[PDB]
Amino acid sequence: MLKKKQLTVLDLHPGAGKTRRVLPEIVREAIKKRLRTVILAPTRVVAAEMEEALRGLPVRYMTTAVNVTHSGTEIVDLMCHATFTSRLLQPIRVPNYNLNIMDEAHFTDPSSIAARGYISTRVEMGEAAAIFMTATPPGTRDAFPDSNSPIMDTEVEVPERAWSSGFDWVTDHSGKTVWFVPSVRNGNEIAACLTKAGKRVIQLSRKTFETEFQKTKNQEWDFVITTDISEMGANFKADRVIDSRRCLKPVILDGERVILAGPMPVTHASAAQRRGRIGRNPNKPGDEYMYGGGCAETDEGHAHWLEARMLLDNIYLQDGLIASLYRPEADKVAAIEGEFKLRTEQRKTFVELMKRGDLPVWLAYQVASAGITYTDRRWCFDGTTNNTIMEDSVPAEVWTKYGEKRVLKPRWMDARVCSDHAALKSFKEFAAGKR
Ligand SMILES: CN(C)S(=O)(=O)c1cccnc1
């Protein structure tokens, strides 16, 4: 795998030991061969798990989730998928790693797709070797892969709202359950219904992941209500996975706006990843997997593949060349390589709106490509009436940096900035000039 010009896909089934057994072996061999190596973790929780697995080995942890200071003699760096893409975008010089290892290489966030495209272009160019570690590589059609112990699979109607009757099997369980819901808002309703019936619930989402996940290990619980984020390495000591098999799809309508379509079916990779959370202990067979719909290839036409092209177009590779997306996923979007390449000063705005402004990729590109400087927020208020952001079924209001009260009405509308109370609270601070 380590020899140059080779992209290796390590597709061992969920729970085989790719992060606690296979990864330290590759690292020892890379250190022995003097290969400058990068290890890419999907999340900060998985970076702290990789540290336990690699403890003792000379690894430089370029993450605040690991409290280890480095000796300076390290040739292996460990960082998140987003961190890698972020430094490629920023004027910081990234070493030309001889070996690139991506764990959970199935992650569909725009920064993970872009990192796969950048790394695979380098392998294609004959400049590096790479290992993509995932039970579900891009293109997998098996939602029921092999496991460490037998799993009871059951097609069942799974509730997506609070209930007063008809779903006894959900509450008549004396064990631990990981329930994959389509959205934070859908999960809040089910969590409230389970709490009312006397259950201890923990809710996990992208924004709360490195705070609430610790609660699964520290306190007793009955259910974990989670979105698709727990598909990327999150391990639990549970005996049941309830899977709605639904998810929200960010879609770009007429190149003018972004909506959150669905709930709609998850891909086979996501259904396999969600089921893979159980059936992991060979001494405890009979972990149940209750699924509530079918699978469809909803990754085609999804905004993350377009956003990844927006990132890759603004990353230097070699002269005027631009990195292509990783081949098994290059057709999920219809895009010309280079069409989103911004000029030097606008690219600087694009990066800041994402890193400091915390705006979704698509939205950041809309603003930066219009010649708007980072701190200019007039666009948050000069959109049409249909772009009015509503909070509590009434127009949201912010105090502008000028001391004036205004209705939130953005020139470009992206549903991700107001898909829950936390996203809208964060966007209101942005529109007010607070960051
Ligand atoms: C094998 N590893 C434990 S892992 O965390 O890389 C993983 C887990 C489940 C599915 N795919 C990969």
Q: Which residue type does 430 have? A: F
Q: Please count the other Cβ atoms lying within 10 Å of the Cβ belonging to residue 133.
A: 22
Q: What is the residue type of 168?
A: D
> Is 19 touching ligand 1 by the criterion CB < 6 Å?
yes
Q: 151-291: same fold as 6-133?
A: yes
The closest residue, in CA terms, to atom 8 on ligand 1 is 14
Q: Is the CB of 16 under 6 A from ligand 1?
A: yes
SS (H, E, C) 92-132: CCCCCCCEEEEECCCCCCHHHHHHHHHHHHHHHCCCCEEEE
Return the ligand 1 atom nearest residue 135 CA: 11
> What is the full DSSP assignment across 58-84?
-EEE-STTS-----S---EEEEEHHHH
Ligand 1 pocket check for 147: Cβ under 6 Å: no
The DSSP string of 366-380 is: HHHTTT--TT--GGG
- Virtual torsion, Cα 17, 20, 25, 30, nearest 10 deg: 120
Max CA pair span of the chain: 64
- Asked whether residue 17 is marked as a ligand-binding residue, the answer is yes
Helix intervals (H) in 264-403: 268-275, 303-312, 344-355, 361-368
Which ligand 1 atom lies nearest to the CA of residue 273?
Answer: 10
Decide yes or no: CATH 3.40.50.300 for domain 151-291: yes
In ligand 1, which atom is closest to the CA atom of 23? Answer: 6
Query: Dihedrals φ, ψ of 35, to 5°?
Result: -95, 125
Question: In whole angstroms, how far apart are CA 335 and each of 66, 301, 306?
Answer: 38, 11, 7
279 marked as part of a ligand binding site:
no
Q: Tell me, in angstroms, the distance from the centre of ligand 1 to residue 428's CA.
A: 38
* C-alpha torsion angle, residues 23, 28, 32, 37 (rounded to 10): 40
Nearest alpha carbon, ligand 1 atom 9: 14
Euclidean distance between CA atoms 112 and 84, whole angstroms: 9
User: For residues 418 and 91, what is the distance between their CA atoms, to the nearest angstrom?
Assistant: 31
Ligand 1 closest atom vs CA 22: 1
Q: How far apart are CA 399 and CA 431, in angstroms?
A: 8
Q: What is the resolution of this structure in A?
A: 2.1
Q: What is the CB neighbour count within 10 angstroms for residue 255? A: 8
Peptide bond between residue 263 and the one before it cis (omega within 30 degrees of 0): yes
162 is annotated as contributing to ligand binding: no
Burial of 1 by CB count in 10 Å (0-12 exposed, 13-18 middle, 19+ buried)? middle
CA 58 from centroid of its chain's CA atoms: 28
Tell me which residue of 121, 159, 167, 68 sits closest to 322, measured CA to CA: 121
Q: Is 18 annotated as a binding residue?
A: yes
Q: In b/e form, how buried is each residue of 85-95, taking b as 16+ CB within 10 angstroms?
A: bbebbeeeebe
Rounded distance from Cα 12 to ligand 1 centre (Å): 8
> Which of 25, 54, 133 is the pocket-test mutation for ligand 1 (most atoms within 8 Å of CB)?
133
Nearest residue to 79 via CA among 97, 71, 269: 97
Q: Within 13 A of 335's CA, how many CA atoms are on the CB side?
A: 29
Distance of CA 27 from the midpoint of ligand 1 (Å): 17
Q: Which atom of ligand 1 is nearest to the CA of 12?
A: 1
**58 annotated as a binding-site residue:** no
* Residues sharing a CB contact under 8 Å with residue 87, sequence separation 6 or more, in sequence order: 79, 94
Q: Is 12 annotated as a binding residue?
A: yes
Burial class, 165, CB count within 10 angstroms (exposed 0-12 / middle 13-18 / buried 19+)? exposed
Q: Which residues, 6 or more positions from 67, have their beta carbon under 8 angstroms from its beta carbon?
A: none
Name the amino acid, one letter, at 194: L
Technique employed here was: X-ray
148 alpha carbon to ligand 1 midpoint, in Å?
Answer: 12
CATH number for 6-133 (one of 3.40.50.1100, 3.40.50.300, 3.20.20.140, 3.40.50.800): it is 3.40.50.300
Q: Is 15 annotated as a binding residue?
A: yes
Separation of 230 CA from ligand 1 center, angstroms? 11
